[PDB]
Amino acid sequence: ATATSISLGIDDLLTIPSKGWLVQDAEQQSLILEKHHHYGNVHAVEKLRQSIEIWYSTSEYLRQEMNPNFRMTDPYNPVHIMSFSGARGNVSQVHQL
Amino acid sequence: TSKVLVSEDGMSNVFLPGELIGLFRAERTGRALEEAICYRATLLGITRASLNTQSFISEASFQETARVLAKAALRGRIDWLKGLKENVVLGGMIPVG
Amino acid sequence: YILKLIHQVDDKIHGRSSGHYALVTQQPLRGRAKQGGQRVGEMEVWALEGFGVAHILQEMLTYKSDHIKARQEVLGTTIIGGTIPNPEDAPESFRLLVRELRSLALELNHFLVSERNFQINRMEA
Amino acid sequence: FIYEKSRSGDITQGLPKVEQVLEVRSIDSISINLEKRIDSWNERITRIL
Amino acid sequence: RSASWICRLCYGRSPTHGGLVELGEAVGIIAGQSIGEPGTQLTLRTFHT
Amino acid sequence: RAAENDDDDDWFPLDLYEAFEEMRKRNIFDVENMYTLADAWGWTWE
Amino acid sequence: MIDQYKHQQLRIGSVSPQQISAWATKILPNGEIVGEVTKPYTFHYKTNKPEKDGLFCERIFGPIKSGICACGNYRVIGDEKEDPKFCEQCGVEFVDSRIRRYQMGYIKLACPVTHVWYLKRLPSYIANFLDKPLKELEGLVYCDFSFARPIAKKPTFLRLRGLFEYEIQSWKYSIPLFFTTQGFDTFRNREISTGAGAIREQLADLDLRTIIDYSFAEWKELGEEGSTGNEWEDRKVGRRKDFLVRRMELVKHFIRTNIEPEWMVLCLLPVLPPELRPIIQIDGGKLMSSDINELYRRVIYRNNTLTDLLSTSRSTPGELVMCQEKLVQEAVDTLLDNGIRGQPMRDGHNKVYKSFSDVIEGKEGRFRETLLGKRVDYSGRSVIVVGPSLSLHRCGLPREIAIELFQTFVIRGLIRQHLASNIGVAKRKIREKEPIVWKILQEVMQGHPVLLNRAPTLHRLGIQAFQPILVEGRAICLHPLVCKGFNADFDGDQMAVHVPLSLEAQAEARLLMFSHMNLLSPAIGDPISVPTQDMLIGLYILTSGNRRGICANRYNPWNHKTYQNERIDDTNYKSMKEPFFCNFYDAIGAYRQKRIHLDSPLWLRWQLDQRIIASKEAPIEVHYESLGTYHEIYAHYLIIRSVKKEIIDIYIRTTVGHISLYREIEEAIQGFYQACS
């Protein structure tokens, strides 16, 4: 663990490539629904029941796509080795960074 | 779950009703005696099961010290020093290991 | 930018072979200013009972604690050298216990009914 | 407006649940099923035997 | 056949040394601790979020 | 007052089922442990 | 196999007044007893010396100094031999002042006193004993709004009995026309007593066997009634039946025991030894007394006032005697169990006193931590650092801590080796940090285990024995593997050390609490010391393999080219391929020269059976020459069989990391086996 050595920089925190589209699309549906909510198309509960569901589904989709991204493109990323080997760091904890 | 409670109308002369004798205590004598034994059941809690112990010293150092000591003194209870807390209280050697 | 904190090691070291004892409980006083001894209680005892060690648990309550007459004798048999003898009388904690249970008009009598003669050997307390 | 949510996994669900079941204040661990059995036995003991 | 103690064979293998439980083991103390320690993972496991 | 998961897992019916073997092989109706209650000493004698 | 029988006992019960008198009263050779402690003289207003017949009465207790009597003379005794037990005028023994903390005081209240526990608490046993409502007896005393009638041995020529009736303002001058009419003591003092006296006499009157018979008859009468028609009737029978059952239980317990009921209404009050309730002597005259002294002083002063009023009967008064007697009773009530009554008395700080029950009951009082949590000698706190060089059976103690724990064993080492003569000389040599002192405190510690204890103990493995060694610094070095056993990090934590002195205790510590026979947790039987974060990452990086596919070659290896192609096999032959090392140590040697990297693949000949975990699998390509060659290529190993004999060509594709790990484990086993013979 010394001769090889490991360290945490800024570019080793590798966000999955598809986050750029998923967050943008999640914002569009939040913009459209909040724009129709002022038109009377939907009621308050429907707006509440959806703004909780896009961001929960999107967040839980990035979390399940984290390891397949790490395990295929950058198998030796310092964040991946630290958590996938079971040393320190949950899958949820890595999801925060 | 190891102790039964002598239900009402089970006076006889050995088990006064309201007593909380053990399960074997009741089932061995029921096979021999012929009065109204008439116990039912107790699923005593983790607190109540420790207050009905064979040694008053252990109970007195757990909860309701004044009541336990008063009842033991009025009855004239005898502790035979078979547990681990009582022998620690007296400074004597515990009978384990 | 790294700082240096106030919890320094020289403010946390300790060591005590013997010394001052409390007037009533007859135990090492407290902490480091009074040259006290480290306390063992509850969970600690539960560990020692778990390991099945009886002499170790016994000597942390009689010898290195309340015994008026046994601390002096371990000091004596430890300055010079001998086989440390197991104590007979209960520590002064039990004596204090029987003392304030006497103040409430209650008894607490020990007995040593012999297995070979059935002769009562009531201890004095 | 009223919406029903849908949590209700169970009231207490950790140490407090273990404390509740271990500390048998009222017998209500599975008494939606257990109390029925116990009362049925206590009323059906008197039989042919 | 008793409630104030236990048997070597009515207990089983000792979980610490891979054999029959030895005479004079405080199995009552071991049972209490091993179901109390975990109790704080219901906390330690929550001590990350 | 409780989340009735219910989820009946290992319960048993409120009937006379499983007479000879009460709960798996738990308590067979002995009829040999307790005639001696009246045979070893006097119960059947009267 | 007859077991080692051991019959021990611990009884408890109420004391008779004669028992207290025998406990406390000490009779001098002149014939005086003087155990009453008449005056509430805590300490002289003069020199802080107490006083005769006071809270710190030296006449009843022992001497305040070993050998010094009340007057001041000293007698050399030092032995249990021919010596005057009492110093004539002093009447005080010269034995040590230990008897100060064991002597028992004793006072007499000129009125019977009901014990608080048996009267004020939940279902008081007095109510069940007399088969009377609690309000009735609570009005007999304390409130004093009653006049009880004790049925006893004496005849009852006075017409009828009555039970009690005194709460009407008309009774001030209504009954005197009907009452007395012939003397005062010859009518009022014959019977109809008030206060606790009537209660105690009633306790001394009823026959237990008749009570058992009557309660059995009442139980039979109650059991033969159907009822079950009204909810009030539903719940009325049950409480009365339970009352009867506990009544016969208590009566039967009384019948076959050495305890008399009259003892619950005590008449003689024991007094706690003085030394256990001392007054702290501070420089300048400051005194930190005990509240126990305050309640005791109040009780004895009010009892003295009672004795003065009663002994001066002559012109007998009325409600004044009752008022003062019940004030004395309430004072004793407060002394015994304060905080349980309606009005808790408070001292000069708006704070309730620490009652005897308060000392007995509580997580900080008695029976909770004084008899369980005991500070011990040969102990010392520290701070914890990590030592990776330590073995599993070893810890590290600071030089400052060790000298203050093994001081006495070093005194051995100095005295026995004749490098010192006396205890004072040895301690002086210790205090000056002589260079030979550490040679002793490196010589008596080898083989003497020490128990390390993490202050916030959580599980069974929070206390463990270790073989200490002397380290330079001020911190205890701890093995990293046992850290999760202690659940200890290194952000700043403290560890307490203890030294077992007894030979048996040392055997226990060495043979039962060492971290090489406690490698499994008792929960389910899982390892408790496993390579954690840093070691785990090291081992994972070691056993990580090469780059399998497209991450090792830019272009496809199909790529029909680079064959050195011509009509004959006589061309340039480089064939870099992978190294063909003979065995492990050849591979490690070639790795040391930096010829190959850690994850660079290589071929290693195998001279054993199959060890690598395989499965149903399939050989990717098995070449077969026209002559028997059986060239088989599996997923990760190559087998060259034949048609005659000698199937020994097993070759494994591997990296130096896996070889290193396997060699480490193998040589560790084969070194432990041969080191231990």
Curated annotation (Swiss-Prot), chain C:
<comment type="subunit">
    <text>In plastids the minimal PEP RNA polymerase catalytic core is composed of four subunits: alpha, beta, beta', and beta''. When a (nuclear-encoded) sigma factor is associated with the core the holoenzyme is formed, which can initiate transcription.</text>
</comment>
<comment type="function">
    <text>DNA-dependent RNA polymerase catalyzes the transcription of DNA into RNA using the four ribonucleoside triphosphates as substrates.</text>
</comment>
<comment type="similarity">
    <text>Belongs to the RNA polymerase beta chain family.</text>
</comment>
<protein>
    <recommendedName>
        <fullName>DNA-directed RNA polymerase subunit beta</fullName>
    </recommendedName>
</protein>
Swiss-Prot record, chain D:
<comment type="function">
    <text>DNA-dependent RNA polymerase catalyzes the transcription of DNA into RNA using the four ribonucleoside triphosphates as substrates.</text>
</comment>
<comment type="similarity">
    <text>Belongs to the RNA polymerase beta' chain family. RpoC2 subfamily.</text>
</comment>
<comment type="subunit">
    <text>In plastids the minimal PEP RNA polymerase catalytic core is composed of four subunits: alpha, beta, beta', and beta''. When a (nuclear-encoded) sigma factor is associated with the core the holoenzyme is formed, which can initiate transcription.</text>
</comment>
<protein>
    <recommendedName>
        <fullName>DNA-directed RNA polymerase subunit beta''</fullName>
    </recommendedName>
</protein>
Curated annotation (Swiss-Prot), chain G:
<dbReference type="InterPro" id="IPR006592">
    <property type="entry name" value="RNA_pol_N"/>
</dbReference>
<keyword id="KW-0479">Metal-binding</keyword>
<keyword id="KW-0150">Chloroplast</keyword>
<feature type="binding site">
    <location>
        <position position="69"/>
    </location>
    <ligand>
        <name>Zn(2+)</name>
    </ligand>
</feature>
<protein>
    <recommendedName>
        <fullName>DNA-directed RNA polymerase subunit beta'</fullName>
        <ecNumber>2.7.7.6</ecNumber>
    </recommendedName>
</protein>
<dbReference type="GO" id="GO:0009507">
    <property type="term" value="C:chloroplast"/>
</dbReference>
<dbReference type="Pfam" id="PF04997">
    <property type="entry name" value="RNA_pol_Rpb1_1"/>
</dbReference>
<dbReference type="GO" id="GO:0003899">
    <property type="term" value="F:DNA-directed RNA polymerase activity"/>
</dbReference>
<dbReference type="InterPro" id="IPR034678">
    <property type="entry name" value="RNApol_RpoC1"/>
</dbReference>
<keyword id="KW-0808">Transferase</keyword>
<dbReference type="GO" id="GO:0000287">
    <property type="term" value="F:magnesium ion binding"/>
</dbReference>
<keyword id="KW-0548">Nucleotidyltransferase</keyword>
<feature type="binding site">
    <location>
        <position position="489"/>
    </location>
    <ligand>
        <name>Mg(2+)</name>
    </ligand>
</feature>
<feature type="binding site">
    <location>
        <position position="71"/>
    </location>
    <ligand>
        <name>Zn(2+)</name>
    </ligand>
</feature>
<comment type="subunit">
    <text>In plastids the minimal PEP RNA polymerase catalytic core is composed of four subunits: alpha, beta, beta', and beta''. When a (nuclear-encoded) sigma factor is associated with the core the holoenzyme is formed, which can initiate transcription.</text>
</comment>
